[PDB]
Structure formats: C-alpha cells, structure tokens
Amino acid sequence: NEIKTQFTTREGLYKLLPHSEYSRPNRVPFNSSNPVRVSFVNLNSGNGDRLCFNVGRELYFYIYKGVRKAADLSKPIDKRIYKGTQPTCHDFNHLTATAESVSLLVGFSAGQVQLIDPIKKETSKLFNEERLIDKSRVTCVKWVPGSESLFLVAHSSGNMYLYNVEHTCGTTAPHYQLLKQGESFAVHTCKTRNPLLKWTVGEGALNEFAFSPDGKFLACVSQDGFLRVFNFDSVELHGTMKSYFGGLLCVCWSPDGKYIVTGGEDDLVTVWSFVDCRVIARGHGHKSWVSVVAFDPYTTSVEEGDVTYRFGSVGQDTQLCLWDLTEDILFPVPLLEPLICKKIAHERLTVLIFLEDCIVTACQEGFICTWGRPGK
Template structure:
C-alpha cells in the first residue's frame, strides 16, 4: 500500500541491525558525527545475476500537490513530451507524528504543458502506454520517492517507509536494461521522469501516473529514439537543460550527445549527416524543424561517461572514455575549454553552485578540481584506492570560519569510489597556489599566484583548447578530511541534501547518513522544516551514479 500522506522519514531505524559486519554506523568529521539513519534496496528475491551489465543509479523525486483539474487537449500525432532533471531532484516534505521532516532538495529544468496517452507510443521493450491494470484514480501520489535501477527493472520506494526492501512499484523492461534516469520536480505537464536504456531508447513518463497504475510496465510513455532508430548505442547519462523549457540531452556510448525538445514530433525524420572527422567536436541540426532529436553533438570517439550542467544552464561539462573533461557554452554550441586526466578515463563530474569549479573523477583514482577562471586543474584530491565513480559539492555546508561576505572561502565536496569509501574534502581558496604559466617567459622557475588569475590565462590558453595532462609537480595536492568505508560493494554515487548524505553502491543499496545534530533535533520535535527552493540549492551533478566500472 502506498503511503502518500506526507513526505517525512521517521527517526526510528533498524539500519544498525542490518549493517554489514565490519562497517560502522557512523563517521566523524570536524563538525561532528554523521549517523546511519536508514537503508533502501531492491527486493531480496531479485537474482544476483540479474544485476549483470548495469550499475545502479539513484534519483530522488518529489511529487507535489495534485494539480487542479483542467480540460485536456490532444496533441498532434507523434507529439512528444517529457520533463525531468538527472541529477536527481528531491526533498522530504513536512510531516506529522511528532517528527521533523528531512529536506531533500535538488533539480533544475523546464517544461511545457502537454497531454499524454497514445497507443501509438507503445514500445518494443516491454512497455505500454495504455494499461488495463487497476488504477487508483484517487491517489494523488504526493510524497518523496527514491527511484533506482537494478538489472532490467526500475524500482520506486517511498522514503517514508522504514522497511529496507520495500519498493512500492517496479517497472520491468523486456529486451533492454534501464541505465540512467532523471526527474523534474517542477514539471508542469505531468511528464517528469526520463529513463534511458542500454539499447539507446529513451522514455518520458509521469511518475504520478506510474504510481497510480498497478502493473509492472510503463504507462502513458512517450518513446524517443525508438529501437535505436537514431542511435543504438547505450544511453550513458540524461540531463534536463536548466531553464530550457522542456529541452533535455542524452549522452551515448559512441561519443554522441543528442538534444531533444518535448514540443517536437517524436516520429519525425531525424537523420543526421555522416561525421566527417570523428576526432573533432561538431554539431549537426535536424533537417526538419519538427524533428526529434533536434541536434547531434559529436563530442569524442569513445563513450561519454557523464554530463553536468552549470546551475544556470550556461555551461555543459562532459567527461569521457578518452580521459578528457570538456566544457561547452551550451547555447552557443561552442567548446570553451577542457583538459586530460592524469591517467585513464574520466567517469563523473559535478559543478559548484557558483559555477567556478568542476569536480571530475575517474580511473586515475584522483579527484580533480578544475577552475573555470583559470581554465585548468588547480588541485588534485589524493585518497582513493580505486576508480572514483561519483563526485559532488556539498552546497549546504558552510565553513565554521566563514567571513560572512557571501564569498566562498572554503568549498566542501565529497567523492565515492570502487574502494567502497566515502571521502570528504575541504578546498580552501587561500591555500591554493595556481601555476600561471607552464614556462616562464625568460627562463627560471614557473610563476605562481594565489587564487584566480584568469586575465593571465586569457592570453595563454585560447578558447576551445584541450590541455594535456598536467605534470604531477604542477598541481597542489589535497588530503581528505574524512575517509570512511560505507558499503561492502563498490560505490556508484552520492547526494548531499540539507540534512543528510546519501550513498549508493553498484548493487542497488542506498544508505542515508544524517548530518551532525540533524537526527537529535528530530527526536520529539513536531516542527516541520521549511522546504528549500530548488532555485537556491539545486543538485549540480546530473549523474549520481557511473555506468563504467572495472570488470
């Protein structure tokens, strides 16, 4: 039975009893102790081999009050809809029962009004757009949910529930596996969830409608790139364009990224010309104005492993199998800058709230801090013992020594890896020494400067330049303030919220770690925490989990 009465998580938890041997239920930081609050996972009956070729990613999703009834209008045949935000968007709503609610916050993106349901959008992957299943029309779906993929299924669980293995909804795909998904908390058209498959197919659906339906197939789905008609390579990441009025992008394993607009025709002619030079970035647009996708961006020759938009949608960052971070001016479709990892592929990326810094992680076991003002790596985080699979800035954390000017003097960020560890880092601006030039103009030692010196780089690094891997001696090193083994399996992602940190492993287990003082303040307190505006604190990483792992 679905509990839609509130969006809170009860403070009671049995997680300590289910914790794996050898793993502590807390970890200490300079600001206090983080405590394991709860765990979520897939049904215990799921066969282990079914996990197979996919890695779990997690999306937090909130469904607001049911919208007021309106007169539906039928869209043109093939009219496409969809809305969501990859990074994951969510918060826990106010609650009753004498507890405080957690505030999960995130998401950015746009949407337009639509009406859905068309039998012509029935896909060949075991999904359905019309259902004969029992539908609870009185269920408005209000609440906060955890969406995650395992094997050939998408699971949806209510974050209010204290049961560990309690998915209230499962959606199965017959011929392909879901590998990435995105949710738009502020979608105005009903279609708020995107799902990308290993076959390249993409679906947009209404999460509320899925919860109302009693079946195990998608209902009311709009189907993009059907049967891989445009691109049959694996979907690697999906992200909604912040402020894009319904535009979203899908990155594929063949190095191409496609731009969609939900107001365009799903089934229109969307063929693109042959890529002339696979080694160069190029953009091609659809020949017809009503086609979807509307554009193809050829990024690189290998897989695009992760994508992330800056908060305002100005910049798009991609990381790939070729080891390069690339930063684009999205609206201008222009490559701005980028650089190579120290070694191997890059797997994940995330933006700071002020869009000044980008985090990347990958096969060199390092966390790179890239400066947009300096257009280069300004710090390396050393501490992981295996590939780094997830990175994120903690936009809710503030330094105890903050100067109150509004300028960030310390950035807190986190990373997770296949070494099963969560690492927390503090990046202090006044301690970063940035090389201004690779070589001095007249011999001697390189010139250095503290802080940002973009004016120097403007004359040194032309727009669109991809830099080689920096020398180890040229990059300042960071050490983590916390290193804690949080799971027994390799980790695939993390999410910072106002009151907790979520970690997820590749096998489909999610843990909720309460911030210092948060769990104590909940006990016996009936106050409800006010919801934080998504515009103030969006989740900046469009990718919570990584799809590339050691085999």
C-alpha cells in the same frame, strides 16, 4: 578492510541510519551489469520527496522519508520491469513536478530513452525506439535546466542528442547537417522532428555531463581523458583539461559554478577553475576508479544564485572521501588529502548525493543508504 557505519568531521558525527534504507522489497543483494542509480524529486506539503532507483530489470518509485523510517518497500507507488534492454540512468523534471504528476526520463542499454509518469501513469513515451539515432548505451540523461520539454542524452558512442518531449520519431535515420566544428567536437542538425541536434565530443564514451548551476555551460568527461566544458546556448568550447592517465568518469560543479570537479580512471579527483581554466588541485585517496563526484551545498560558505567548499567522491574501491578546498588551496599544483576516507560498502559505490538532512549513497548491490548529518 571492514565496513564503517559512521565517521566524524568538524561538523560532528554522520551515521548510517539502517532503518532509512531503501531497496528491492525482496531485500536480497543484487549481483551480476548496469550501475544502480538514484533520482530525487520534490512535489512543491510535508512528505513530498520521491525517490527513484534502478537495479537489474526493475525500476522502483517510492516516497523518500529522509532520515525517518523508510516507507514500506512492500508497496511502491510505481514499479517497472524491463525484460529486454535494462535501465542505465534517469532524471526527474524539477520544473514540472506536482503532486498530480512527475516527468521521469529513463535511459537504456540499447540506447533508447523512455518518458514515464510514475504518479498519474497515463504517460509512457519512447525515444529512439528503433535505435536508428544511436545503438550504444545511454550513459546520462538530464532535463535541460529551466526547460519543460528539452532533454540531453549522452551515449557510449561519444555523442549527445537533444530531444523535445513534444516532438516525434523519426521513422528514418536523420540526415544531419553541420552547424559548428571545433577542437575535438562537432554539432549537427537535421532537416517538428525529434533529435534537434547531434553533438559529437572527443573520442570514445561520453561518461557523464553536468550543467552549470546556472544552466549556461555544459561540462563533459570522456573516455579519452578530457574534461570539456562548453557554452551551451552559444555552442563553443570554453576550456578543457586532460588527466595524466585513463579516461574521466564523472563531473560536478561547485554550487556557485566557479569550479568543476572530475574523478577518474587514475583514482584522482581533480579541481579545475572555471574562470582561470587551470587545474587548482588534485586528491589521492581512492584505491581505484572514482565513480561519483559531488559538491555538498550544505557545508560550503558560498552563496548560490538565481571561502570554503566541501565535496565528496565514491569509487570502485568501495570508499567514500570528503574534501575541503579552502583559500590557501584556492589562492596561494597542490595535493588535497581527504578529511575522511572510509570503506562504507561491500561492493562498488555508484551514488553520492548531498541532501539537507543527510547524505545518500548506494552500492552495486542495490541498497540505497541514508547518512544522518550531525544534529539531524
């Protein structure tokens, strides 16, 4: 059980580039908490990638230099210290990013959400400041796809809320009115004001949601074991799935949106067909909870929009897995086995991101790592 710094697949060698590392400038391993999370944004010239990540009380904002030597950690573009409630997750707005400005949403432990312009720095807005909408920790925030102003935030309590950046408040707790009830979910409105709708799903924590690559559907995974995928604009259940044990912790779509992938408290990744609403396969490999699942849009034969797939997963077992699902697997319930299953961290993995030049992982210690793709 020793750490690996590289692995081989059909594409060649992947290699941990330690001089691309990002972290706290101090550089000492963080130990205690809230998961370390990572967001990337582009600003439409040469070095226009930004990285944001969080640690304990610190939010950092840097230039991300991909597979090159990392930008000087001594001098971040922006840094925030939160002395009360601490960050849990965050999301850039890819629609309104520019060199002059980016909209960063940040969610917190006590359920607040902050909007931050880490570039121009003349913007800082609080949502749910008095905690009257929800007291429980934010688990996930996402700008609504294709939107300049709407975002969706999930909570520990089992709810999601829709917010408009441009609206306010409120000063009193919202009086809700039903709009749809369904199999294990409801949706409410209230009666220019800031939670637009409250969206109750299943029972227990809403761990993660992910929009379909076309933004038309929402996929959710809860502490009750359910994957639930909605028709976002329509607001109605499209299909569900339950694991045999424990809750589902993370989700992702295939880059063509035909497949949903979950990872769970039973250590399995599950593949699930969006059109057939059936489970397509399951993969054993993690020796513990699967904490992140992602499709690799750069090693897949499908053309995205507006046959093979690659995805990966990282878990609390400190391991990375990669997975192929082919025609044999898709169109013959079968068991995937990982192309690779390496230990790559000293502590629980919290980030899996597939970029064009590389793969990015992070661990709970606060180190953001870059993995050079073969030939890059």
